[PDB]
Design a protein around this ligand. Sequence first.
Ligand SMILES: Cc1cc2nc3c(=O)[nH]c(=O)nc-3n(C[C@H](O)[C@H](O)[C@H](O)COP(=O)(O)O)c2cc1C
Length: 169
Amino acid sequence: AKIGLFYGTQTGVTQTIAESIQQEFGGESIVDLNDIANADASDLNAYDYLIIGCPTWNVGELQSDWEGIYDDLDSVNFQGKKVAYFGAGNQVGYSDNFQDAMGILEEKISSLGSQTVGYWPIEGYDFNESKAVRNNQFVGLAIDEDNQPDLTKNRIKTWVSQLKSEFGL
Ligand SMILES: Cc1cc2nc3c(=O)[nH]c(=O)nc-3n(C[C@H](O)[C@H](O)[C@H](O)COP(=O)(O)O)c2cc1C
């Protein structure tokens, strides 16, 4: 497919979100779904458009599978690639580290020459700090199934609609 979606998940939430994103884009013919646990860093090179999904764990940490491939990311040349991000988190329980993983990954990948697309508004959430915020906007879609599951569906539909324009679809 033209879009490669790479996600990591601990309790399956991020995978379900990934599956809904693939669905909103039009299915397997448009988006390839890849679990980062089964991938090599070089797999990210095959796509000009990428969607990176990662839940924040252990108070501001990357999900373990993303943690394991993190240092390998340097071997991939992201110059020219457009990358979008999404993450699952808990704003009430982890108010000072809400969606940190998404921010850690965005900082890393953009420093490697990629272009970040898919900025999201922070107003629909209540948290103190997040490494995923730059100039009052989230660098990607923030999902909270723990406290705002009723908003997930429309958040995905709205974000994908916005992303289609960026990806030339
Ligand atoms: C031990 C533990 C630590 C967590 N730490 C954070 C955190 O630092 N920041 C955050 O936003 N959410 C945090 N969460 C919430 C998770 O990211 C959230 O439950 C998410 O849905 C998990 O997704 P997964 O099923 O894809 O792994 C934590 C959850 C648990 C159980």
